[PDB]
Write an enzyme that holds these catalytic residues in place. Sequence first.
Site, PDB file in Angstrom:
ATOM      1  N   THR A   6       0.853  -1.212   0.000  1.00 40.62           N
ATOM      2  CA  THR A   6       0.000   0.000   0.000  1.00 40.62           C
ATOM      3  C   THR A   6       0.862   1.225   0.000  1.00 40.62           C
ATOM      4  O   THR A   6       1.903   1.252   0.619  1.00 40.62           O
ATOM      5  CB  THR A   6      -0.881   0.067   1.242  1.00 40.62           C
ATOM      6  OG1 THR A   6      -1.713  -1.090   1.297  1.00 40.62           O
ATOM      7  CG2 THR A   6      -1.769   1.278   1.203  1.00 40.62           C
ATOM      8  N   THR A   7       0.419   2.241  -0.716  1.00 38.98           N
ATOM      9  CA  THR A   7       1.033   3.554  -0.689  1.00 38.98           C
ATOM     10  C   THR A   7      -0.053   4.544  -1.067  1.00 38.98           C
ATOM     11  O   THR A   7      -0.652   4.446  -2.132  1.00 38.98           O
ATOM     12  CB  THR A   7       2.244   3.674  -1.661  1.00 38.98           C
ATOM     13  OG1 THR A   7       3.282   2.764  -1.274  1.00 38.98           O
ATOM     14  CG2 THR A   7       2.822   5.063  -1.634  1.00 38.98           C
TER      15      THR A   7
END
Lengths: 220, 220, 220, 220, 220, 222, 222, 222, 222
Positions: free
Chosen positions: I1-2
């Site tokens: 995730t980012t």
Amino acid sequence: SPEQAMRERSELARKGIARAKSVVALAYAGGVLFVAENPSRSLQKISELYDRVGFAAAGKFNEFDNLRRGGIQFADTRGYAYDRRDVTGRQLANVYAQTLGTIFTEQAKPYEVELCVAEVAHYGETKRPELYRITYDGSIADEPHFVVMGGTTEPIANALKESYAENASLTDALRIAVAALRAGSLGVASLEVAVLDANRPRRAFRRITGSALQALLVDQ
Amino acid sequence: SPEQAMRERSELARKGIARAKSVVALAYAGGVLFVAENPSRSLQKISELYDRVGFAAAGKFNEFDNLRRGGIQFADTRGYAYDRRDVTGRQLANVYAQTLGTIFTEQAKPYEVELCVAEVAHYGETKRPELYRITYDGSIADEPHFVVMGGTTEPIANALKESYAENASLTDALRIAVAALRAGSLGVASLEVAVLDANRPRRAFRRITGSALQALLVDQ
Amino acid sequence: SPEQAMRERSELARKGIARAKSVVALAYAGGVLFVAENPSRSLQKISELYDRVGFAAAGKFNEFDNLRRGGIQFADTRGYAYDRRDVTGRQLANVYAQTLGTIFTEQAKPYEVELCVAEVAHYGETKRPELYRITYDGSIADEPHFVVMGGTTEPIANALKESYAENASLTDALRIAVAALRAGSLGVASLEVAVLDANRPRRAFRRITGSALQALLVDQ
Amino acid sequence: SPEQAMRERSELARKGIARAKSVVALAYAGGVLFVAENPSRSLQKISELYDRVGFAAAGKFNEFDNLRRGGIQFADTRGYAYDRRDVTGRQLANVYAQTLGTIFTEQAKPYEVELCVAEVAHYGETKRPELYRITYDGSIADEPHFVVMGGTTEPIANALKESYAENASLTDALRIAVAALRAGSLGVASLEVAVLDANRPRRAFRRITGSALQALLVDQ
Amino acid sequence: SPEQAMRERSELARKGIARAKSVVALAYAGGVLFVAENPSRSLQKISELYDRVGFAAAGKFNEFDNLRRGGIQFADTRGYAYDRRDVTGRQLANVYAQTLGTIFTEQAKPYEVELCVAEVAHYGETKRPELYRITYDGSIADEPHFVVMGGTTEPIANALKESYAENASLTDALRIAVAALRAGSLGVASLEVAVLDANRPRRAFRRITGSALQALLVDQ
Amino acid sequence: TTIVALKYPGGVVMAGDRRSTQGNMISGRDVRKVYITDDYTATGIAGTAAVAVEFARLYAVELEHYEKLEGVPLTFAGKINRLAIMVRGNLAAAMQGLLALPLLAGYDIHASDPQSAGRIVSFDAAGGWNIEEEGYQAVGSGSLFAKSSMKKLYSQVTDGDSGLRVAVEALYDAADDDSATGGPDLVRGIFPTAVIIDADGAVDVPESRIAELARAIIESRS
Amino acid sequence: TTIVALKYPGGVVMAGDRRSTQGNMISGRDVRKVYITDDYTATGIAGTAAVAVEFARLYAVELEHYEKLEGVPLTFAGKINRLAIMVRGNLAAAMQGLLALPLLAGYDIHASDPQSAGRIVSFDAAGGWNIEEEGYQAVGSGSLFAKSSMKKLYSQVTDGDSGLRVAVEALYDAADDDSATGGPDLVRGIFPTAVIIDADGAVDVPESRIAELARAIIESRS
Amino acid sequence: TTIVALKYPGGVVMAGDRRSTQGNMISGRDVRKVYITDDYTATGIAGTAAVAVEFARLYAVELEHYEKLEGVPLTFAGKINRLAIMVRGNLAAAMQGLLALPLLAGYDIHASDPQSAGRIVSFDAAGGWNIEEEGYQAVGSGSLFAKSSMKKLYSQVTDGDSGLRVAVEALYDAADDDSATGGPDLVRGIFPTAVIIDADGAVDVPESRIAELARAIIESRS
Amino acid sequence: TTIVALKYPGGVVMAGDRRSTQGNMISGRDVRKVYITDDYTATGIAGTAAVAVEFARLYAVELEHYEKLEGVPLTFAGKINRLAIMVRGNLAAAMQGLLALPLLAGYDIHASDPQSAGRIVSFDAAGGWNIEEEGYQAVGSGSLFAKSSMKKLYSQVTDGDSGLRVAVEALYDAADDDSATGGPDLVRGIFPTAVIIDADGAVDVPESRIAELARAIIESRS
């Protein structure tokens, strides 16, 4: 007027009892016979409680069906707590008397019912079948022979004061009962009948069906 | 005046019932037919409870809709607790009777409603459809043929005492019903209609829509 | 006197309603129009509840503003519990009916209000906008065309029984409304106006400001 | 007599209000001015609530001081919950209205008070200062210009209906106020005065001391 | 009769107050003087609350001794919560006013008492000693000079309206007090006397014993 | 412990041994592991003995309690569900040690073909259940063995007495491999208990026909 | 983190950096660590950043809450006690990780000699407190360094602007040794915040006089 | 265990095996792992068997309960949410052991294009959910294998019967690699169960067309 | 995730990928990680996916709930506080595993200069928050990489479309280093989602301009 107040309550209840149908139970050879007039097919005024103890009541249905459950509630519990053999119906009489007693004081309107708890000795053992009458106000008395309640009793009760065959046969007691019941009024195979068969091994309750009923029923 | 007090309650309720609309249910060939006059499109006076048991009531809406939910509440739970096949509507009758019974005593003003719970045998099995009438005061009685409630019944009920075709067809019973309903008063495709289709596999409830209704509806 | 008691309550409430200002809502081309006389700038008698449902009430402010919150309270929760699309206003009608129903019994003094919940179909979908009137005693009825409440209705209601343009334009319906409102009595850009714009994508509520109001307002 | 009962309550309260001292607030150039006659040095009838909202009440002290706290209670909490900028005084008006509303029904004797909540726009922002009047029975109304309460208002109120300088100066409005107050009756530097200085950065409340008061005070 | 009901309460209390003994406190050079007639040796009607605040009451003992404790209860706590210097007696006045206020509403019979809380400036600091009168109904007022309560006040109060030496000496104020007290009626060294000695470092309370009392006492 | 239930044409039979092991030291030789719950339902329970007699006893009361109340016995579906709840409401205990695992055998008087009205329901420690539909099932210390022998001897099941023999033979086969199971004690005269259910009802099989049956198996193997 | 408070003739000054470390990786460079609580009280807080902004904010409300209620601000004694309670009612958290340790700086408008009315109160994780009476105090990751430099530069404290420079110089001295403290960031234009309190009140020192002061110290050391 | 759901033009199909493993020892060969929840919703559940039949059964009641109450079935959005809650309200259990992970397959009768009205929603142990929008999904002991085979055979999905074959072929491919999955048992006549949903409703696929389909795959591989 | 948010002259942009990792095994490729909370507020959430969609959804309701109640939306200050509470009331969970960390992006319609009205607020596991005032921020598995690339490409931010490209380029740079982040999937046609906020409102950026933008970055690097 706490005193006069109580008289009003009694009245209200005693009236409801009268305007409801008639219910009778009595002691016969093999145990206790339960008979009450009931047009309905599903709404029963007579029921099993525990192994050797029967329930029959007359009055406002929703009120006594409640108590009926409470009984079965109390009984089953008691039997698991200690043992089956330790439920007495004399116990249940106390309970109902307590409950109705409280109701007649705490609840806004007192229950319009009159009840009957009946026990008949265990399988092997031989003992005099016992009957208890619990009234709306919580009073409790035990008849040794037969109990009448609901509607006008005097004629139905009087018919029995004589027609009562101390050691009647099933068919004989039924005959006596239905006839004694007509005394306060018909009396067709359209009513509710069950017995506490002392002879039965464990569960001493048996409802008398429609077909088999006829075999024993009284002509008018 | 605990006695006179109760008379006032009865009154207040019995009145509300009268000033409200009329609702009728009856036994027909395929099960039970529910019909009541209702101008509203959304506020329904007839509803499903469980698989094979229907609810219909007349009176103050917010009061019976409450009870309607409570029923569905009780039913669903009971079926998860034990099994679907162990809900009876005879049960729900007891419950409503208990509830209304309490209300009539505890609540300040008693509910202005009259209720009808109806059961119709499971898919395969064949059995006589059963109807129950639960009154505002908690009294409960079961009609074997048809039930009327709300508004003035005598003329609507009387029309049925004769018009009742024991083994009617859907279209025939609807005809009978709508006409029997007009008897206490019109009667347009602007009302509420649904049935308990004994023929249906599981969920024996089906509401009769607007278009398909016409096909069966009675000319006046 | 439980019966006579209830009459007094009705009275007290019914009176309060009358001595309060007038509020009217009606069905038009693009949805539902809310218009009520209100000198105040901040105290609003008309409000949004959920995406497609409006609230309007007349009576004692602090009492209906409470209910207004409770609605928004209930709605939002319901939409989070299940989904936005599962709030109906027909639901909120039931709730308000329940609530007011309880108040009218339990609370010392019953609420001096009359309420209106209005729903108008979702964005794409096309459906007949629905109006509900919930009274102080908990009674509930649904008008298909227009609802009037607060003050003396007969003249305001009567004006509409004729002036009601089934498929009015916004400006046309506003015209009809303000004029129909003057019928029970002025009628300046110093009052409260908002609509449920069925045309709007999600939130179908929009208040009509002071400047833009003028563009549509009726000459007297 | 639930109806007649409520009239008695109104009376009892309305009376207490009258026999208590006079309190007035109004809109001036720099915000809102609070002035009420008060011989006491410590018992204050006017108080800060939140950053930009003032409280002033007349009646039975111990009763409105309670409410005064409750307000400060509610406000502070609300501001910590969300943000300072999200307290409105319009909010506190609702709350007081709710509270007094409940009291007037639940509590044995209803509060003998009349209240005023006043907001004046935030530092930079410029907006019309708003005044709210909350009565003993929970009714709530908002004056756009000035509010009078406690004792006999008619003469004090009337004096203002004319002497009200829409955009008065502090000294001018004080002059107007004290003189308008003498109208219902003296008026010495022995009374309570404070203002909501819209000009102030954050906390828009300031009490007018004894010495500095004189500089602005009206000759009689 | 919620209105008439409250009048009866007032009465009952106001009466009890009268039939009880007399108590007076006043402002003198070194602080506040507490003097009340009391034959008892142990049952005290005057007491310390906190560092710089005194309690004196007249009425039904068991009722005001209760309140006396509650005060000490509240005070001590408050001082531990924040600091000694943050207890005001103006605070305790509020509390007593709140408490008695509640009692007069909730409790069956309202307290038969009248109370006086008195504060005198801290050691170094110099400030005008303050007196508060809290009545049975919860009303609260502050005298700047002297307070009278219990029995018939008019003569005792009147004697003081003149005999009050603004800046009296201890012995002078005592003289004034005892004489002013005899005015409503003797006055022997058989009564209760204590003072709030502003001059004292921390605990500004000191009871005047039997022997030392004589040195200052007034001849009749 | 080893309990086993069998499905034959008429109805179902269930029988379990009476050994009771505590460590690897015998502490009972006469324990009733199988009980009649009501007219058409019998229930056997393995694991902790304290929870065993309590399940059987308590369950039985709950079933009869419903009947007395509603006037009609539960669906076989209901009967299954009640028992299943009971088991879940004991997970807390079972986690620590008090593990009691039931095996339900019954006759659905309402079953379509009243020759398949025999039912066997095995239960999950967590409260799960699968209607076996495979004729045989076993739970307990040596169930693994019973099930595996009874696999071969199932063809032989023909009727009541027929099935019953296969049951008693599995219990013998089990005890022959699971030291905690305990086969037929001749020297002391102690034999596994059994219960049969058909359209007529559920009844205890008298040790007589079991003991006789036991010796049959012992001699034939001998 | 490093907060520091100074006592000078007029009143007190308090200033703390704005670095924010998470591991040994910067995660902030602009954190307000010192807040004005009310007119004569400023409070700086070290440790967990979540509890930091919460203490300051909540405390401030409680102080003003008392004033609005009783009509008069608390004694300086009270102000100290309230904050102390707050800290104790957080021991539970602090035990696990959420440790927030305040430093209170204030001006007692009621002090005997209003030139000693400057107050510094340091706080104990358990809820303790000592009125410093030594002119300087510091709390935080590099307080140890500040306190020890500020020891030397205290003689130099003469007045407001005078004291403030010693504050900013300690914060510089701290950051020079505590990698978790963070000195003045010229490249980005980020400088420690400060608050002063004298008889007039408590006011934020504008970064202007700080940034200027910062460069003074940087050049002088250069 | 392996449950798998497929999206085809008409709507969706879902099918899961019936093996039941306890350790590495078979303890079931007939478990219903996929259930019809309501008219347009079917739900399969992997992990602990006790929680499995409970989720399916209870959920179904909740859905129908809403309908009976509000008079209208929930949005597909709602249906998703309710199930999701249920799963979160079981994290406590799942943490210790009782892990039950659903897979929802449904037909949105309100979908824009009623040929994309097929829906597959996979669920998170914590209560999360993603609408798959990729045609296939699988949960369970060997889902990893199914998903990876079904990746190749997805182009072959054309219609109902078409998609159903790919489902049954994945379940075969799974059981061929996951000893805890269990493919088609010919010797005993036990085949994976399946449910299809299209505009008409959701119906159980009769083993007949499955068993037939199964042999196809076995022979073609043979 | 980012997830990453950018501040440009007009307002703010926020965009996060759609990968979903479970172990080192992909379990999603289409997850919506950024949501519009209300007209001027968008919120992205990293960590446990279950708590992610729940935070966003629930928050949104709470904001709108205040508005419907009080008649006016919350201050941006309020909006920040509510979210902050929500995060603290989840510390219990986050401690054990269920960690959900938000990133708030918004437009203060009340900001002094409505060209700095772009706001970015990052959040602390404990419930802390700092208004970023530095133009860019990122949270997640590969935020560390985004932030460090976006550091260089920030000068390039000029306007809406301008800033948006830097956002999508960071997400590409992130996914290029964080195996758990997932860059643009051409083969399948899956691109990071984005939301922009300016004086006009907050609106979803259509994948069209993103997909286009993505290829730009891929080709230019190629």
